[PDB]
A paper describes a structure:
MTB are an extraordinary group of prokaryotes that utilize CDF proteins for iron transport and biomineralization of magnetic iron nanoparticles within intracellular membrane-enclosed organelles called magnetosomes. MamM was recently proposed to function as a magnetosome-directed iron transporter required for iron biomineralization, since its deletion abolished magnetite biomineralization.
The X-ray determined structure of MamM-CTD V260R contained two tightly packed monomers in the asymmetric unit. While the wild-type MamM-CTD structure contains a disordered C-terminal tail (residues 293-318), a rigid conformation was adopted by residues 294-302 in a single V260R monomer comprising the dimer. This rigid C-terminal extension gave rise to the formation of a fourth β-sheet aligned in parallel to the three existing β-sheets located in the inner metal-binding interface of the dimer. As such, the V260R dimer structure presents a dramatic increase in the dimerization interface surface (377 Å2), in reference to the dimerization interface surface of the wild-type (193 Å2). According to the V260R determined structure, the altered dimerization interface is stabilized asymmetrically by several salt bridges, polar and hydrophobic interactions located at the top and bottom of the dimer. The twisted dimeric fold of V260R allows the formation of the central putative binding site but prevents the formation of the wild-type His264-Glu289 double peripheral binding sites. However, by examining the V260R dimer, we could predict two alternative peripheral symmetrical binding sites between Glu268-His264, each from a different monomer. Although the V260R mutant dimer was able to bind the same number of zinc cations as the wild-type dimer in vitro, it was not functional in vivo.
Author numbering:
A (entry chain B): 211 to 302
B (entry chain A): 211 to 291
């Protein structure tokens, strides 16, 4: 595809469909054999309270883990973006 | 004992000292290249709101990450118990 890339993009689209998500900021995905362990940073509206931001992260974790075959583990955290800015997901 | 056994005890000791934590229910840690990735479940008092339970989880993450350099990613969730 490359393959990790096709899977990275599927993780991103699954997250980006969760209500409250304003973009995937960063995805780090590591291949343990066939399995994937991931750590994702999502953007959320700066209007959100901390409580609200936490629930968006929990919903992303459930949604991505439910949809993406061989996600062994996923951690999601949140950053308050934007007033505008701006950016396409990055990957490592 | 082994490196991973020693790492798992430090994680559990670090977590159990965070205010709000009522025991470590479950811990999985694994090596991935040069790094350690882990996932953990803490016990929290049932009286805690969900908001409160999330803030305990975050505090564990910061504490354990701060104390154990080689951990690249740690996920913490909570069960009321």
């Amino acid at each position: 595809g490359s393959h990790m890339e096709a899977v990275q993009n599927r993780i991103v689209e699954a997250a980006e469909r969760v209500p409250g998500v304003r973009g995937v900021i960063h995805l780090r995905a590591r291949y343990v054999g066939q399995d994937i362990w991931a750590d994702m940073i999502i953007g959320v509206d700066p209007e959100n309270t901390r409580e609200q931001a936490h629930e968006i992260c929990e919903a992303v974790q459930a949604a991505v883990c439910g949809k993406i075959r061989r996600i062994e583990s996923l951690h999601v955290s949140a950053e308050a973006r934007e007033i505008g800015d701006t950016t396409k997901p990055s990957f490592s």
